[PDB]
Amino acid sequence: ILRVLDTSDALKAFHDMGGVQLICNNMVTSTRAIVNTARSMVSTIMKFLDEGIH
Amino acid sequence: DQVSKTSIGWLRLLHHCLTHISDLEGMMASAAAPTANLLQTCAALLMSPYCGMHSPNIEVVLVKIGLQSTRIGLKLIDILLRNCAASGSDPTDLNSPLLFGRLNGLSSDSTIDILYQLGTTQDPGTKDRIQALLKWVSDSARVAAMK
Amino acid sequence: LVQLCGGERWWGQFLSNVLQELYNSEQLLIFPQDRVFMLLSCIGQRSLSNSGVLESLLNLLDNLLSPLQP
Amino acid sequence: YNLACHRLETLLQSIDLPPLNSANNAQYFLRKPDKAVEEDSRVFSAYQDCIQLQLQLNLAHNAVQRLKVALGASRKM
């Protein structure tokens, strides 16, 4: 998708079909839908209070 | 890959659209800005662990989309300084964005750089941004007199 | 304190108060978080027979979630 | 002891501490970067030197006081 939009005319066409609003709404909705999987405070409190697969 | 797991894929598209060609930047930003909850989502994605795209690229998106109008600049200042929650977010609705997981007013080097870009830049409406910053400082000082 | 003040009425609420004022996001005092956390876990496992310990902690958890469900 | 304490004070002012209130601070706490590790090791070495020489100074002071009071000079009331 990035390679498709590599030219000025392609970017103008992308704007003229409402692509940018589409991707903004998509980012908002997807951020709402998913839940972060990266470790956090809970996974530090547990490290204290104690390929590489074991 | 983080693109499929996370929602950072769309932010990369937005960054490319805004910053691929400087000529197209203004009208990109004008079309992108009026979307609801966009700034809060971008800020929440910025103040998160590295999830696919480095922080400097996100700062560029936040700066460019916030410098195209006075209202958007004030909204960005407010969300960065005092209220990072999603606007119009009632918990009763199970589809509206919430973004409840971050404490307000958290500061990182990226946020400091964004505020410095917002303030130091010279363009019409920068006086409104300076007024907003001074108003926030005054409000914080007044609240500090809780005794 | 477990042996002396454990198992009485105002106990438990003391634990909730001290936990709230030590681990508050508004607290700027620098101290060992996790070592005090083991201390509180041990002070909780002992004197667990007190009926006020769990109810006070659940009341504290109830207040923190009060922004939800307005 | 004064010189070692000054060195430790400078080295330990050189560091800071995240408050453990966000995801980034927690992630830093899981995986301490290499610079943090080496700084912590250097601070530990400085603290060990300071405490050892402090113990040496304390025992020297105790011996001096014992000898001073042994010859007949009265200690502080």
Side-chain angles (χ1 to χ4, degrees), chain C residues 19-66:
Chain C
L19 176 82
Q20 172 163 234
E21 68 186 0
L22 286 177
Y23 290 86
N24 218 3
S25 287
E26 293 82 3
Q27 176 48 267
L28 294 174
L29 196 143
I30 296 91
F31 72 99
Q33 311 278 327
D34 170 86
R35 280 82 65 193
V36 173
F37 196 61
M38 283 75 74
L39 170 66
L40 278 189
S41 161
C42 181
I43 210 168
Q45 281 173 344
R46 309 166 98 101
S47 79
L48 202 70
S49 67
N50 195 323
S51 297
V53 168
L54 272 297
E55 65 183 1
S56 67
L57 288 202
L58 293 181
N59 283 280
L60 169 58
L61 195 53
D62 188 12
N63 282 256
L64 306 164
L65 300 169
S66 71

mmCIF file of all heavy atoms in Angstrom, chain C residues 19-66:
data_model
loop_
_atom_site.group_PDB
_atom_site.id
_atom_site.type_symbol
_atom_site.label_atom_id
_atom_site.label_comp_id
_atom_site.label_asym_id
_atom_site.label_seq_id
_atom_site.Cartn_x
_atom_site.Cartn_y
_atom_site.Cartn_z
ATOM 1 N N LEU C 19 -2.475 1.253 52.724
ATOM 2 C CA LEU C 19 -2.216 0.887 51.336
ATOM 3 C C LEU C 19 -2.601 2.018 50.392
ATOM 4 O O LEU C 19 -1.850 2.347 49.465
ATOM 5 C CB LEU C 19 -2.978 -0.391 50.987
ATOM 6 C CG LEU C 19 -2.903 -0.881 49.542
ATOM 7 C CD1 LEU C 19 -1.623 -1.662 49.311
ATOM 8 C CD2 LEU C 19 -4.112 -1.730 49.207
ATOM 9 N N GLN C 20 -3.757 2.642 50.629
ATOM 10 C CA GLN C 20 -4.211 3.726 49.768
ATOM 11 C C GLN C 20 -3.272 4.921 49.835
ATOM 12 O O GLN C 20 -2.957 5.525 48.803
ATOM 13 C CB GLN C 20 -5.630 4.137 50.155
ATOM 14 C CG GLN C 20 -6.132 5.384 49.454
ATOM 15 C CD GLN C 20 -7.638 5.523 49.530
ATOM 16 O OE1 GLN C 20 -8.313 5.672 48.512
ATOM 17 N NE2 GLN C 20 -8.174 5.475 50.744
ATOM 18 N N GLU C 21 -2.811 5.280 51.032
ATOM 19 C CA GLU C 21 -1.958 6.456 51.152
ATOM 20 C C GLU C 21 -0.490 6.166 50.868
ATOM 21 O O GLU C 21 0.298 7.112 50.772
ATOM 22 C CB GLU C 21 -2.102 7.079 52.542
ATOM 23 C CG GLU C 21 -1.546 6.242 53.676
ATOM 24 C CD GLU C 21 -1.843 6.851 55.031
ATOM 25 O OE1 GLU C 21 -2.485 7.921 55.071
ATOM 26 O OE2 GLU C 21 -1.441 6.261 56.055
ATOM 27 N N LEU C 22 -0.098 4.899 50.734
ATOM 28 C CA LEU C 22 1.272 4.593 50.344
ATOM 29 C C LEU C 22 1.414 4.362 48.848
ATOM 30 O O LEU C 22 2.399 4.804 48.246
ATOM 31 C CB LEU C 22 1.776 3.361 51.095
ATOM 32 C CG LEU C 22 2.121 3.529 52.572
ATOM 33 C CD1 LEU C 22 2.521 2.186 53.153
ATOM 34 C CD2 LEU C 22 3.220 4.557 52.758
ATOM 35 N N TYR C 23 0.453 3.681 48.228
ATOM 36 C CA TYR C 23 0.525 3.366 46.809
ATOM 37 C C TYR C 23 -0.311 4.306 45.957
ATOM 38 O O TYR C 23 -0.611 3.982 44.806
ATOM 39 C CB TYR C 23 0.095 1.920 46.569
ATOM 40 C CG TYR C 23 1.093 0.916 47.084
ATOM 41 C CD1 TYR C 23 1.059 0.494 48.402
ATOM 42 C CD2 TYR C 23 2.083 0.408 46.259
ATOM 43 C CE1 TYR C 23 1.972 -0.417 48.880
ATOM 44 C CE2 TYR C 23 3.002 -0.503 46.729
ATOM 45 C CZ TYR C 23 2.942 -0.912 48.039
ATOM 46 O OH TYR C 23 3.857 -1.822 48.510
ATOM 47 N N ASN C 24 -0.696 5.458 46.499
ATOM 48 C CA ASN C 24 -1.479 6.417 45.739
ATOM 49 C C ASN C 24 -0.673 6.953 44.564
ATOM 50 O O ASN C 24 0.543 7.143 44.649
ATOM 51 C CB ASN C 24 -1.921 7.569 46.639
ATOM 52 C CG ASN C 24 -3.320 8.043 46.328
ATOM 53 O OD1 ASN C 24 -4.003 7.476 45.477
ATOM 54 N ND2 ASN C 24 -3.758 9.090 47.018
ATOM 55 N N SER C 25 -1.366 7.197 43.452
ATOM 56 C CA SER C 25 -0.723 7.833 42.311
ATOM 57 C C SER C 25 -0.343 9.275 42.611
ATOM 58 O O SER C 25 0.505 9.841 41.913
ATOM 59 C CB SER C 25 -1.640 7.774 41.091
ATOM 60 O OG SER C 25 -1.708 6.459 40.570
ATOM 61 N N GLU C 26 -0.949 9.876 43.631
ATOM 62 C CA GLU C 26 -0.617 11.218 44.077
ATOM 63 C C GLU C 26 0.511 11.240 45.100
ATOM 64 O O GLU C 26 0.918 12.325 45.528
ATOM 65 C CB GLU C 26 -1.857 11.897 44.670
ATOM 66 C CG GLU C 26 -2.961 12.190 43.665
ATOM 67 C CD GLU C 26 -3.846 10.992 43.393
ATOM 68 O OE1 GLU C 26 -3.642 9.942 44.034
ATOM 69 O OE2 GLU C 26 -4.747 11.101 42.535
ATOM 70 N N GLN C 27 1.021 10.080 45.501
ATOM 71 C CA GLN C 27 2.062 10.013 46.518
ATOM 72 C C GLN C 27 3.426 10.236 45.876
ATOM 73 O O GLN C 27 3.786 9.545 44.918
ATOM 74 C CB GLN C 27 2.021 8.668 47.237
ATOM 75 C CG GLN C 27 3.129 8.486 48.255
ATOM 76 C CD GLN C 27 3.277 9.684 49.171
ATOM 77 O OE1 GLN C 27 4.067 10.591 48.907
ATOM 78 N NE2 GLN C 27 2.511 9.695 50.254
ATOM 79 N N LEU C 28 4.183 11.195 46.404
ATOM 80 C CA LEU C 28 5.519 11.496 45.910
ATOM 81 C C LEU C 28 6.624 10.992 46.828
ATOM 82 O O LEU C 28 7.801 11.247 46.554
ATOM 83 C CB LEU C 28 5.677 13.002 45.695
ATOM 84 C CG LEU C 28 4.807 13.609 44.593
ATOM 85 C CD1 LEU C 28 4.948 15.122 44.569
ATOM 86 C CD2 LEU C 28 5.166 13.011 43.243
ATOM 87 N N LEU C 29 6.282 10.293 47.907
ATOM 88 C CA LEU C 29 7.301 9.734 48.784
ATOM 89 C C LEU C 29 7.961 8.537 48.113
ATOM 90 O O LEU C 29 7.278 7.631 47.626
ATOM 91 C CB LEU C 29 6.686 9.322 50.120
ATOM 92 C CG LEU C 29 7.635 9.066 51.292
ATOM 93 C CD1 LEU C 29 7.010 9.551 52.588
ATOM 94 C CD2 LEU C 29 7.988 7.593 51.394
ATOM 95 N N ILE C 30 9.290 8.530 48.093
ATOM 96 C CA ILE C 30 10.062 7.444 47.503
ATOM 97 C C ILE C 30 10.366 6.430 48.595
ATOM 98 O O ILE C 30 10.929 6.779 49.640
ATOM 99 C CB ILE C 30 11.357 7.960 46.853
ATOM 100 C CG1 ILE C 30 11.043 8.885 45.674
ATOM 101 C CG2 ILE C 30 12.222 6.796 46.399
ATOM 102 C CD1 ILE C 30 10.932 10.351 46.044
ATOM 103 N N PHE C 31 9.997 5.179 48.355
ATOM 104 C CA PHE C 31 10.152 4.121 49.343
ATOM 105 C C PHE C 31 10.145 2.790 48.612
ATOM 106 O O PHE C 31 9.744 2.717 47.442
ATOM 107 C CB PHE C 31 9.036 4.179 50.401
ATOM 108 C CG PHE C 31 7.693 3.739 49.895
ATOM 109 C CD1 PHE C 31 7.235 2.455 50.135
ATOM 110 C CD2 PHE C 31 6.888 4.609 49.183
ATOM 111 C CE1 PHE C 31 6.003 2.048 49.671
ATOM 112 C CE2 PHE C 31 5.653 4.207 48.719
ATOM 113 C CZ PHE C 31 5.211 2.924 48.963
ATOM 114 N N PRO C 32 10.594 1.714 49.262
ATOM 115 C CA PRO C 32 10.525 0.400 48.613
ATOM 116 C C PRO C 32 9.091 -0.067 48.437
ATOM 117 O O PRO C 32 8.429 -0.446 49.407
ATOM 118 C CB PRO C 32 11.297 -0.511 49.577
ATOM 119 C CG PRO C 32 11.284 0.209 50.881
ATOM 120 C CD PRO C 32 11.339 1.658 50.531
ATOM 121 N N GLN C 33 8.603 -0.043 47.198
ATOM 122 C CA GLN C 33 7.232 -0.460 46.932
ATOM 123 C C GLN C 33 7.054 -1.948 47.204
ATOM 124 O O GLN C 33 6.142 -2.363 47.929
ATOM 125 C CB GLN C 33 6.862 -0.138 45.483
ATOM 126 C CG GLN C 33 7.191 1.276 45.040
ATOM 127 C CD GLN C 33 6.138 2.277 45.455
ATOM 128 O OE1 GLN C 33 4.952 1.958 45.515
ATOM 129 N NE2 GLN C 33 6.564 3.502 45.735
ATOM 130 N N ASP C 34 7.937 -2.768 46.637
ATOM 131 C CA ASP C 34 7.694 -4.205 46.589
ATOM 132 C C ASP C 34 7.979 -4.872 47.931
ATOM 133 O O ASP C 34 7.275 -5.804 48.335
ATOM 134 C CB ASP C 34 8.512 -4.823 45.455
ATOM 135 C CG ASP C 34 8.514 -6.330 45.489
ATOM 136 O OD1 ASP C 34 7.580 -6.940 44.926
ATOM 137 O OD2 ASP C 34 9.485 -6.905 46.013
ATOM 138 N N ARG C 35 9.011 -4.416 48.644
ATOM 139 C CA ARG C 35 9.261 -4.958 49.978
ATOM 140 C C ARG C 35 8.116 -4.646 50.936
ATOM 141 O O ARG C 35 7.665 -5.521 51.689
ATOM 142 C CB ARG C 35 10.600 -4.448 50.512
ATOM 143 C CG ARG C 35 11.802 -5.206 49.947
ATOM 144 C CD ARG C 35 12.255 -4.751 48.564
ATOM 145 N NE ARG C 35 12.774 -3.390 48.526
ATOM 146 C CZ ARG C 35 12.989 -2.711 47.408
ATOM 147 N NH1 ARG C 35 12.719 -3.229 46.221
ATOM 148 N NH2 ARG C 35 13.498 -1.484 47.481
ATOM 149 N N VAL C 36 7.609 -3.411 50.903
ATOM 150 C CA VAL C 36 6.412 -3.098 51.675
ATOM 151 C C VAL C 36 5.238 -3.936 51.190
ATOM 152 O O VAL C 36 4.343 -4.277 51.972
ATOM 153 C CB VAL C 36 6.111 -1.588 51.610
ATOM 154 C CG1 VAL C 36 4.778 -1.270 52.265
ATOM 155 C CG2 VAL C 36 7.219 -0.808 52.289
ATOM 156 N N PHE C 37 5.225 -4.303 49.907
ATOM 157 C CA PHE C 37 4.128 -5.128 49.414
ATOM 158 C C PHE C 37 4.184 -6.541 49.986
ATOM 159 O O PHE C 37 3.145 -7.103 50.343
ATOM 160 C CB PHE C 37 4.121 -5.163 47.889
ATOM 161 C CG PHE C 37 2.830 -5.669 47.312
ATOM 162 C CD1 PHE C 37 1.645 -4.999 47.557
ATOM 163 C CD2 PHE C 37 2.799 -6.811 46.534
ATOM 164 C CE1 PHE C 37 0.455 -5.455 47.035
ATOM 165 C CE2 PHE C 37 1.610 -7.271 46.009
ATOM 166 C CZ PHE C 37 0.437 -6.592 46.259
ATOM 167 N N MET C 38 5.376 -7.144 50.075
ATOM 168 C CA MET C 38 5.458 -8.435 50.763
ATOM 169 C C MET C 38 5.079 -8.288 52.228
ATOM 170 O O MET C 38 4.451 -9.180 52.808
ATOM 171 C CB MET C 38 6.837 -9.101 50.684
ATOM 172 C CG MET C 38 7.221 -9.787 49.388
ATOM 173 S SD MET C 38 7.648 -8.697 48.051
ATOM 174 C CE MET C 38 9.255 -8.217 48.676
ATOM 175 N N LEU C 39 5.488 -7.185 52.856
ATOM 176 C CA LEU C 39 5.124 -6.986 54.254
ATOM 177 C C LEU C 39 3.610 -6.942 54.421
ATOM 178 O O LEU C 39 3.059 -7.551 55.345
ATOM 179 C CB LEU C 39 5.760 -5.707 54.790
ATOM 180 C CG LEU C 39 5.261 -5.282 56.170
ATOM 181 C CD1 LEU C 39 5.676 -6.292 57.225
ATOM 182 C CD2 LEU C 39 5.778 -3.903 56.512
ATOM 183 N N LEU C 40 2.920 -6.247 53.517
ATOM 184 C CA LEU C 40 1.465 -6.166 53.587
ATOM 185 C C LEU C 40 0.811 -7.501 53.249
ATOM 186 O O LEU C 40 -0.227 -7.851 53.818
ATOM 187 C CB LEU C 40 0.954 -5.068 52.657
ATOM 188 C CG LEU C 40 1.025 -3.649 53.216
ATOM 189 C CD1 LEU C 40 0.306 -2.680 52.300
ATOM 190 C CD2 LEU C 40 0.442 -3.600 54.615
ATOM 191 N N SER C 41 1.389 -8.254 52.314
ATOM 192 C CA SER C 41 0.857 -9.578 52.012
ATOM 193 C C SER C 41 0.973 -10.501 53.217
ATOM 194 O O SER C 41 0.041 -11.253 53.526
ATOM 195 C CB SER C 41 1.580 -10.174 50.805
ATOM 196 O OG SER C 41 1.418 -11.580 50.758
ATOM 197 N N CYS C 42 2.114 -10.461 53.908
ATOM 198 C CA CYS C 42 2.284 -11.268 55.112
ATOM 199 C C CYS C 42 1.342 -10.812 56.220
ATOM 200 O O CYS C 42 0.730 -11.643 56.900
ATOM 201 C CB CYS C 42 3.734 -11.210 55.584
ATOM 202 S SG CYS C 42 4.074 -12.193 57.062
ATOM 203 N N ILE C 43 1.209 -9.497 56.414
ATOM 204 C CA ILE C 43 0.271 -8.972 57.398
ATOM 205 C C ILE C 43 -1.173 -9.254 57.018
ATOM 206 O O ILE C 43 -2.064 -9.128 57.864
ATOM 207 C CB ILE C 43 0.487 -7.456 57.595
ATOM 208 C CG1 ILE C 43 0.110 -7.030 59.007
ATOM 209 C CG2 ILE C 43 -0.357 -6.657 56.634
ATOM 210 C CD1 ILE C 43 0.561 -5.633 59.353
ATOM 211 N N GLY C 44 -1.424 -9.629 55.767
ATOM 212 C CA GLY C 44 -2.755 -10.007 55.341
ATOM 213 C C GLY C 44 -3.021 -11.485 55.522
ATOM 214 O O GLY C 44 -4.093 -11.868 55.994
ATOM 215 N N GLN C 45 -2.054 -12.329 55.149
ATOM 216 C CA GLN C 45 -2.222 -13.767 55.334
ATOM 217 C C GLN C 45 -2.397 -14.106 56.808
ATOM 218 O O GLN C 45 -3.291 -14.873 57.181
ATOM 219 C CB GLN C 45 -1.032 -14.520 54.740
ATOM 220 C CG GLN C 45 -1.092 -14.667 53.229
ATOM 221 C CD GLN C 45 0.176 -15.257 52.647
ATOM 222 O OE1 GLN C 45 1.217 -15.290 53.301
ATOM 223 N NE2 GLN C 45 0.094 -15.729 51.408
ATOM 224 N N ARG C 46 -1.549 -13.543 57.663
ATOM 225 C CA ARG C 46 -1.832 -13.557 59.086
ATOM 226 C C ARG C 46 -2.924 -12.541 59.397
ATOM 227 O O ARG C 46 -3.139 -11.577 58.659
ATOM 228 C CB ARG C 46 -0.572 -13.260 59.895
ATOM 229 C CG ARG C 46 0.618 -14.119 59.514
ATOM 230 C CD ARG C 46 1.904 -13.567 60.095
ATOM 231 N NE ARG C 46 2.274 -14.259 61.322
ATOM 232 C CZ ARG C 46 3.194 -15.210 61.400
ATOM 233 N NH1 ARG C 46 3.867 -15.609 60.332
ATOM 234 N NH2 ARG C 46 3.447 -15.776 62.576
ATOM 235 N N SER C 47 -3.632 -12.778 60.499
ATOM 236 C CA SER C 47 -4.803 -11.992 60.883
ATOM 237 C C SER C 47 -5.895 -12.039 59.821
ATOM 238 O O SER C 47 -6.787 -11.186 59.801
ATOM 239 C CB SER C 47 -4.433 -10.537 61.190
ATOM 240 O OG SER C 47 -4.266 -9.796 59.994
ATOM 241 N N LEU C 48 -5.833 -13.025 58.923
ATOM 242 C CA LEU C 48 -6.890 -13.216 57.941
ATOM 243 C C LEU C 48 -8.191 -13.669 58.586
ATOM 244 O O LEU C 48 -9.254 -13.530 57.975
ATOM 245 C CB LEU C 48 -6.449 -14.234 56.889
ATOM 246 C CG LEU C 48 -7.146 -14.204 55.529
ATOM 247 C CD1 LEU C 48 -6.763 -12.962 54.754
ATOM 248 C CD2 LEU C 48 -6.796 -15.450 54.740
ATOM 249 N N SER C 49 -8.124 -14.211 59.806
ATOM 250 C CA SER C 49 -9.335 -14.615 60.512
ATOM 251 C C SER C 49 -10.230 -13.423 60.814
ATOM 252 O O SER C 49 -11.445 -13.585 60.975
ATOM 253 C CB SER C 49 -8.970 -15.343 61.804
ATOM 254 O OG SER C 49 -8.350 -14.461 62.723
ATOM 255 N N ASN C 50 -9.650 -12.228 60.912
ATOM 256 C CA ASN C 50 -10.443 -11.023 61.101
ATOM 257 C C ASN C 50 -11.405 -10.841 59.936
ATOM 258 O O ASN C 50 -11.009 -10.917 58.769
ATOM 259 C CB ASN C 50 -9.527 -9.806 61.230
ATOM 260 C CG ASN C 50 -10.242 -8.589 61.785
ATOM 261 O OD1 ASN C 50 -11.410 -8.346 61.482
ATOM 262 N ND2 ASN C 50 -9.540 -7.813 62.599
ATOM 263 N N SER C 51 -12.673 -10.599 60.255
ATOM 264 C CA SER C 51 -13.688 -10.416 59.228
ATOM 265 C C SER C 51 -13.637 -9.038 58.585
ATOM 266 O O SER C 51 -14.339 -8.810 57.595
ATOM 267 C CB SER C 51 -15.079 -10.655 59.818
ATOM 268 O OG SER C 51 -15.216 -11.992 60.266
ATOM 269 N N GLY C 52 -12.833 -8.118 59.121
ATOM 270 C CA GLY C 52 -12.755 -6.783 58.557
ATOM 271 C C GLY C 52 -11.700 -6.603 57.489
ATOM 272 O O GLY C 52 -11.754 -5.619 56.746
ATOM 273 N N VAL C 53 -10.744 -7.528 57.394
ATOM 274 C CA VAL C 53 -9.632 -7.355 56.464
ATOM 275 C C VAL C 53 -10.120 -7.420 55.021
ATOM 276 O O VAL C 53 -9.826 -6.535 54.210
ATOM 277 C CB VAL C 53 -8.538 -8.400 56.736
ATOM 278 C CG1 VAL C 53 -7.533 -8.421 55.597
ATOM 279 C CG2 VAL C 53 -7.845 -8.108 58.054
ATOM 280 N N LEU C 54 -10.874 -8.467 54.678
ATOM 281 C CA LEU C 54 -11.302 -8.632 53.292
ATOM 282 C C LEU C 54 -12.359 -7.608 52.908
ATOM 283 O O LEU C 54 -12.340 -7.084 51.789
ATOM 284 C CB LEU C 54 -11.824 -10.048 53.056
ATOM 285 C CG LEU C 54 -10.801 -11.113 52.652
ATOM 286 C CD1 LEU C 54 -10.168 -10.757 51.316
ATOM 287 C CD2 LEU C 54 -9.742 -11.303 53.718
ATOM 288 N N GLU C 55 -13.296 -7.317 53.811
ATOM 289 C CA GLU C 55 -14.357 -6.372 53.480
ATOM 290 C C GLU C 55 -13.797 -4.974 53.241
ATOM 291 O O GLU C 55 -14.264 -4.258 52.348
ATOM 292 C CB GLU C 55 -15.421 -6.366 54.577
ATOM 293 C CG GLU C 55 -14.955 -5.855 55.924
ATOM 294 C CD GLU C 55 -16.037 -5.937 56.981
ATOM 295 O OE1 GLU C 55 -17.146 -6.417 56.662
ATOM 296 O OE2 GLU C 55 -15.782 -5.525 58.131
ATOM 297 N N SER C 56 -12.784 -4.575 54.010
ATOM 298 C CA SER C 56 -12.180 -3.261 53.812
ATOM 299 C C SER C 56 -11.463 -3.181 52.471
ATOM 300 O O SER C 56 -11.568 -2.177 51.757
ATOM 301 C CB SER C 56 -11.218 -2.949 54.957
ATOM 302 O OG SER C 56 -10.101 -3.820 54.929
ATOM 303 N N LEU C 57 -10.726 -4.234 52.110
ATOM 304 C CA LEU C 57 -10.038 -4.245 50.823
ATOM 305 C C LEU C 57 -11.030 -4.236 49.669
ATOM 306 O O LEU C 57 -10.814 -3.559 48.657
ATOM 307 C CB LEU C 57 -9.118 -5.460 50.731
ATOM 308 C CG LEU C 57 -7.857 -5.422 51.596
ATOM 309 C CD1 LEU C 57 -6.806 -6.362 51.039
ATOM 310 C CD2 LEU C 57 -7.314 -4.009 51.695
ATOM 311 N N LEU C 58 -12.128 -4.982 49.800
ATOM 312 C CA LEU C 58 -13.142 -4.982 48.753
ATOM 313 C C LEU C 58 -13.851 -3.638 48.657
ATOM 314 O O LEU C 58 -14.221 -3.216 47.558
ATOM 315 C CB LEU C 58 -14.147 -6.106 48.994
ATOM 316 C CG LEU C 58 -13.571 -7.515 48.851
ATOM 317 C CD1 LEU C 58 -14.642 -8.566 49.072
ATOM 318 C CD2 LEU C 58 -12.918 -7.690 47.494
ATOM 319 N N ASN C 59 -14.056 -2.958 49.785
ATOM 320 C CA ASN C 59 -14.616 -1.612 49.742
ATOM 321 C C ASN C 59 -13.660 -0.644 49.059
ATOM 322 O O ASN C 59 -14.089 0.219 48.284
ATOM 323 C CB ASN C 59 -14.945 -1.135 51.156
ATOM 324 C CG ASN C 59 -16.212 -1.759 51.700
ATOM 325 O OD1 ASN C 59 -17.318 -1.325 51.378
ATOM 326 N ND2 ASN C 59 -16.059 -2.783 52.529
ATOM 327 N N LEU C 60 -12.362 -0.767 49.341
ATOM 328 C CA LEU C 60 -11.371 0.065 48.666
ATOM 329 C C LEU C 60 -11.384 -0.183 47.163
ATOM 330 O O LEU C 60 -11.344 0.759 46.365
ATOM 331 C CB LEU C 60 -9.982 -0.205 49.241
ATOM 332 C CG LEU C 60 -8.799 0.386 48.475
ATOM 333 C CD1 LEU C 60 -8.921 1.895 48.350
ATOM 334 C CD2 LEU C 60 -7.491 0.005 49.140
ATOM 335 N N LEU C 61 -11.440 -1.453 46.762
ATOM 336 C CA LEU C 61 -11.514 -1.781 45.341
ATOM 337 C C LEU C 61 -12.810 -1.278 44.722
ATOM 338 O O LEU C 61 -12.844 -0.944 43.533
ATOM 339 C CB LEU C 61 -11.380 -3.289 45.149
ATOM 340 C CG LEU C 61 -11.087 -3.782 43.734
ATOM 341 C CD1 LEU C 61 -9.881 -3.067 43.159
ATOM 342 C CD2 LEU C 61 -10.867 -5.284 43.742
ATOM 343 N N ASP C 62 -13.884 -1.226 45.510
ATOM 344 C CA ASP C 62 -15.154 -0.709 45.017
ATOM 345 C C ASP C 62 -15.055 0.778 44.697
ATOM 346 O O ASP C 62 -15.603 1.240 43.690
ATOM 347 C CB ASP C 62 -16.249 -0.972 46.052
ATOM 348 C CG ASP C 62 -17.635 -0.638 45.540
ATOM 349 O OD1 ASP C 62 -17.791 -0.420 44.323
ATOM 350 O OD2 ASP C 62 -18.576 -0.597 46.361
ATOM 351 N N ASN C 63 -14.358 1.542 45.541
ATOM 352 C CA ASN C 63 -14.275 2.984 45.333
ATOM 353 C C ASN C 63 -13.409 3.331 44.130
ATOM 354 O O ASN C 63 -13.698 4.292 43.408
ATOM 355 C CB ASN C 63 -13.742 3.665 46.593
ATOM 356 C CG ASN C 63 -14.799 3.809 47.666
ATOM 357 O OD1 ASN C 63 -15.336 4.896 47.880
ATOM 358 N ND2 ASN C 63 -15.106 2.713 48.346
ATOM 359 N N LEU C 64 -12.339 2.568 43.896
ATOM 360 C CA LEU C 64 -11.458 2.854 42.769
ATOM 361 C C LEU C 64 -12.159 2.662 41.431
ATOM 362 O O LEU C 64 -11.865 3.384 40.473
ATOM 363 C CB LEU C 64 -10.213 1.977 42.836
ATOM 364 C CG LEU C 64 -9.440 2.043 44.146
ATOM 365 C CD1 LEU C 64 -8.484 0.874 44.239
ATOM 366 C CD2 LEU C 64 -8.696 3.359 44.239
ATOM 367 N N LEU C 65 -13.067 1.696 41.339
ATOM 368 C CA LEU C 65 -13.800 1.437 40.109
ATOM 369 C C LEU C 65 -15.048 2.297 39.973
ATOM 370 O O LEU C 65 -15.772 2.161 38.982
ATOM 371 C CB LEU C 65 -14.179 -0.043 40.024
ATOM 372 C CG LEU C 65 -13.008 -1.026 40.038
ATOM 373 C CD1 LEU C 65 -13.506 -2.445 40.223
ATOM 374 C CD2 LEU C 65 -12.185 -0.904 38.769
ATOM 375 N N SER C 66 -15.315 3.172 40.940
ATOM 376 C CA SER C 66 -16.511 4.004 40.877
ATOM 377 C C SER C 66 -16.583 4.933 39.666
ATOM 378 O O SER C 66 -17.711 5.277 39.274
ATOM 379 C CB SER C 66 -16.642 4.812 42.178
ATOM 380 O OG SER C 66 -15.657 5.823 42.266
#
